[PDB]
Write an enzyme that holds these catalytic residues in place. Structure first.
Site, short mmCIF file in Angstrom:
data_model
loop_
_atom_site.label_atom_id
_atom_site.label_comp_id
_atom_site.label_asym_id
_atom_site.label_seq_id
_atom_site.Cartn_x
_atom_site.Cartn_y
_atom_site.Cartn_z
N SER A 115 21.46 16.84 -24.62
CA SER A 115 22.48 16.03 -23.97
C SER A 115 22.67 14.66 -24.61
CB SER A 115 22.15 15.86 -22.49
OG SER A 115 22.36 17.06 -21.77
N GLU B 240 25.18 26.35 -25.29
CA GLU B 240 24.53 27.01 -26.42
C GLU B 240 23.89 26.02 -27.39
OE1 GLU B 240 27.81 27.89 -25.68
OE2 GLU B 240 27.68 29.98 -25.04
C1 NXL Z 1 21.16 17.73 -21.76
O1 NXL Z 1 20.27 17.94 -22.51
N1 NXL Z 1 21.48 18.70 -20.72
C2 NXL Z 1 22.58 18.51 -19.72
C3 NXL Z 1 22.07 18.59 -18.29
N2 NXL Z 1 21.30 17.35 -17.93
O2 NXL Z 1 19.99 17.26 -18.51
S1 NXL Z 1 19.76 15.72 -19.04
O3 NXL Z 1 19.81 14.71 -17.93
O4 NXL Z 1 18.35 15.50 -19.54
O5 NXL Z 1 20.79 15.40 -20.09
C4 NXL Z 1 21.31 19.84 -18.04
C5 NXL Z 1 20.28 20.17 -19.05
C6 NXL Z 1 20.73 19.99 -20.50
C7 NXL Z 1 21.56 21.22 -20.91
N3 NXL Z 1 20.94 22.55 -20.80
O6 NXL Z 1 22.67 21.12 -21.30
#
Ligand code: NXL
Length: 263
Positions: A45, A143
């Site tokens: 993210s 993905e």
């Molecule tokens: C980012 O890595 N993601 C988006 C979402 N939030 O997690 S975060 O706060 O650490 O950014 C869910 C998990 C993850 C994803 N699987 O996209």
């Protein structure tokens, strides 16, 4: 300091996984401490900060307007869409989508913004053209979080990510108003509670973006400093650990507690 470096080493041992670390001075660009700085880690993210930088660059050029309203549908909703699931009927503005992508890590918001710029290739081309030939985005949400070992897709290095953030936050690329909007969104992060923020003393500024993915992937990028003003950039990534999410949170927070204590 070596103490922070030791804490990063300890984390690697206790997690059984690679940890990448960079502490960078915001004004001068000088690296104050590093650890595995040229090794690749999944961005997860944390890429959403670079994505909204690309969006702001298009806003500066007049190719995008922050008030422009984007309407989408239910079949566009991917996993983890806490804000975009609430606006199927009214749509959302580009500004609102960047706020959701950064402050709540909304995944559909990130995909909608990637479409506005032309996808992960144009994000990589944006990063390329601003001097980052290392960081690359190749896939969409979710993905891009696969974190397959030794896969170079959707990765950065601690050193590339830290210097790229600096340029975005304080470099000549974006306009002053766009630099300020990007750090505002980051300062409004509400999903990085257990990480560097947990080590932050009262009165300190932090603007950050965290991430997590498969295979024990966990990370954060931040600009932070004392007296309500950012003064440094910290990047921490890890991948490969079977540890729980709470463990990885604690390891990152202790690195933060460490670098805060020898600031
Ligand atoms: C980012 O890595 N993601 C988006 C979402 N939030 O997690 S975060 O706060 O650490 O950014 C869910 C998990 C993850 C994803 N699987 O996209």
């Amino acid at each position: 300091h070596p103490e922070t470096l030791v804490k990063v080493k300890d984390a690697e041992d206790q997690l059984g996984a690679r940890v990448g670390y960079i502490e960078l001075d915001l004004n001068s660009g000088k690296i104050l401490e590093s650890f595995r700085p040229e090794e690749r880690f999944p961005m997860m993210s944390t890429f959403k900060v670079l994505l909204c930088g690309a969006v702001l660059s298009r806003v500066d050029a007049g190719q995008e307007q922050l008030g422009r309203r984007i309407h989408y549908s239910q079949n566009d909703l991917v996993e983890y869409s806490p804000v975009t699931e609430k606006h199927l009927t009214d749509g959302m503005t580009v500004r609102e989508l960047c706020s959701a992508a950064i402050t709540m890590s909304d995944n559909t918001a990130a995909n909608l913004l990637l479409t506005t710029i032309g996808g992960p290739k144009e994000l990589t081309a944006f990063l390329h053209n601003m001097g980052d030939h290392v960081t690359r985005l190749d896939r969409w949400e979710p993905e891009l979080n696969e974190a397959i070992p030794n896969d170079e897709r959707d990765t950065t290095t601690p050193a590339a990510m830290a210097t790229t953030l600096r340029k975005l936050l304080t470099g000549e690329l974006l306009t002053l108003a766009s630099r300020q909007q990007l750090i505002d969104w980051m300062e409004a992060d509400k999903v990085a509670g257990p990480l560097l923020r947990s080590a932050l003393p009262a009165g300190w500024f932090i603007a950050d973006k965290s991430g997590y993915g498969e295979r024990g992937s966990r990370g954060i990028i931040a600009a932070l400093g004392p007296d309500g003003k950012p003064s440094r950039i910290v990047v921490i990534y890890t991948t490969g650990s079977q540890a729980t999410m709470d463990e990885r949170n604690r390891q990152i927070a202790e690195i933060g507690a460490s670098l805060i204590k020898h600031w």
